[PDB]
Amino acid sequence: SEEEEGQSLWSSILSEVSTRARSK
Amino acid sequence: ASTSDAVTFITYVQSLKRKIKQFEKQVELYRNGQRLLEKQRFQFPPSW
Amino acid sequence: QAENIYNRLGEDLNKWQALLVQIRKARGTFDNAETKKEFGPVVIDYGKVQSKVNLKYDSWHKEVLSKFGQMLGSNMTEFHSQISKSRQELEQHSVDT
Amino acid sequence: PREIVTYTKETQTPVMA
Amino acid sequence: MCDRKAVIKNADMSEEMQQDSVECATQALEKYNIEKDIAAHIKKEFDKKYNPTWHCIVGRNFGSYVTHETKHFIYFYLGQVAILLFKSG
């Protein structure tokens, strides 16, 4: 569904940005 | 070469000398901010 | 980031419906029944952390529900304001000038 | 004369349930 | 005591009219143990205040369709009874 698709897309984008920030 | 240009260069040097303390304060603020944003995990904005 | 999530989601009604559908699906995906799902000789004690994390995922779903509630309150207020302005115009100085 | 302002405030009015 | 307040679900009317209607309906419901008698008291107060006569809706199940003139029309829920009191003329 496009609903969960957009939710997971925002989730994946946030995950990628955070993981880039989470090099540590 | 001109007297006015030499005075302008001297004024720029004096402004840099006066702003050296402000630049050191900004450097300390930048170091503290980098440490804080790293520790808290406050991720920078993508366009930021 | 909540602000980033809201900015990406925007004020499109289809966006709000999609956010609601996805959040409902995700919240339904957290049916915590078995806690100590120990896969091997060493018991992986994911139980209490996973139960509290599912409570936190539902808490994030409730926070998203509240944020979408505020967004839909703003959107419904805007739609009702526009429709009521049109109705007030029709009541005071109707289209038949 | 008297004009008709049909600015009806239609809404969802549910029964008790 | 049930609170016959109003939520922002549909509100295009006069505030004084809405407050008078809510207070009259709740007071009549509290005073008269019969729902019909409470409705009669509410109608009597409304016809005494905003001239006679008009009928309002206060009950469990409520819904209709009419050209609701402004300043005396709303569609909400006043506590345990749906608040749909619109005066047309």
Cβ contact D–B (≥3 pairs, < 8 Å): no
Q: Report residue E76: phi and psi, to 5°.
A: -145, -165
Reference E61, options E39, E42, E33, E80; nearest CA is: E80
Find the CATH number of the domain harbouring E43: 3.30.740.10
Q: Give the long-range contacts of residues B7-13, CB within 8 A, separation 24 or more.
A: none
Could you give the CA distance from residue C26 to residue C20 in angstroms, rounded to a whole number?
Answer: 10
Could you give the CA distance from residue C61 to residue C55 in angstroms, rounded to a whole number?
Answer: 10
Reference A4, options E43, E65, C36, C18; nearest CA is: C18
Report which secondary-structure segment, H or E, holds E48. Answer: helix E35-49
Q: Which structural domain, as residue segments, surrounds residue E88?
A: 5-89
Mark which residues 1-20 of A lie under 8 Å from B by CB.
Answer: 17-18
Terminal CA-to-CA distance of chain C, rounded, Å? 52
Centre a 10 Å sphere on the Cβ of residue E82 and count the other Cβ atoms it contains. 23
Q: Which residues contact E18 (CB under 8 A, 6 or more apart)?
A: E6, E11, E74
Centre a 10 Å sphere on the Cβ of residue E70 and count the other Cβ atoms it contains. 19
Backbone Cα Rg of chain C = 22
For residues B1-25, one letter each, b for 16 or more C-beta atoms within 10 angstroms of the residue's C-beta and e for the rest, the string is eeeeeeeeeeeeeeeeeeeeeeeee
Question: Nominal resolution in Å?
Answer: 4.4
C87 to chain D, any CB pair closer than 8 A? The answer is: yes
Angle at C35 between CA C31 and CA C40, to 5 degrees: 125
Best probe of the C interface among A1, A2, A3, by most C CBs < 10 A, is A3
Q: Which chains lie within 8 Å of chain D at 3 or more CB pairs, if any?
A: C, E
Cβ contact A–E (≥3 pairs, < 8 Å): no
Q: Report residue B12: phi and psi, to 5°.
A: -65, -40
Name the amino acid, one letter, at E47.
Answer: D
Alpha helix ranges (H) inside chain A: 2-21
The answer to whether C35 and C51 have CB atoms below 8 angstroms apart is: yes
Q: How far is CA B30 from CA A3, B18, B34, B36, B47, in A?
A: 41, 19, 6, 10, 18
Could you give the CA distance from residue E85 to residue B9 in angstroms, rounded to a whole number?
Answer: 81
C-alpha distance from C77 to closest chain D C-alpha (Å): 14
Centre a 10 Å sphere on the Cβ of residue E29 and count the other Cβ atoms it contains. 24
Number of domains in chain E: 1
